[PDB]
Amino acid sequence: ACDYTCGSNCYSSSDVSTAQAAGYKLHEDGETVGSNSYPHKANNYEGFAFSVSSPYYEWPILSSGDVYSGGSPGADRVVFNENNQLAGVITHTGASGNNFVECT
Numbered sequence: 001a002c003d004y005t006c007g008s009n010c011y012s013s014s015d016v017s018t019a020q021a022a023g024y025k026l027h028e029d030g031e032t033v034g035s036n037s038y039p040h041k042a043n044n045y046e047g048f049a050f051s052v053s054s055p056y057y058e059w060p061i062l063s064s065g066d067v068y069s070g071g072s073p074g075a076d077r078v079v080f081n082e083n084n085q086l087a088g089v090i091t092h093t094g095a096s097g098n099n100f101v102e103c104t
């Protein structure tokens with residue numbers, strides 16, 4: 001069983017924790033990776049019911065189990081805050097264009 005399902009993609013809690021820690025370390029040192037500048041501000045245009053406070057930052061979570069360091073992001077993103085608390089895991093899979101849906 002998947003703890004988070006993003007279209008076809010299966011994610012456990014450890015997958016989410018490894019991706020989040022990588023994302024936060026880079027946020028605090030003011031560094032970014034890749035061509036789209038990861039991590040950046042997750043603005044929340046969709047209006048999701050995140051039980052943690054604002055501002056929100058998005059970072060890629062890869063299907064292969066590897067951490068992001070440059071190149072292709074994929075469809076899936078883990079959202080954390082300024083406190084290093086998980087907001088949720090979102091995806092562009094099954095959403096129109098550059099929009100998002102929450103992972104089930």
Ligand SMILES: Nc1nc2c(ncn2[C@@H]2O[C@H](CO)[C@@H](O)[C@H]2OP(=O)(O)O)c(=O)[nH]1
Nearest residue numbers: 036041042043044045046058077098099100
């Ligand atoms: N859909 C959407 N896109 C956002 C939001 N905050 C930042 N973006 C980023 O802006 C683009 C929308 O033009 C998206 O492809 C997405 O980048 P990522 O590709 O980095 O996930 C948001 O809350 N909603």
Ligand SMILES: [Ca+2]
Nearest residue numbers: 011012015065
């Ligand atoms: Ca895994």
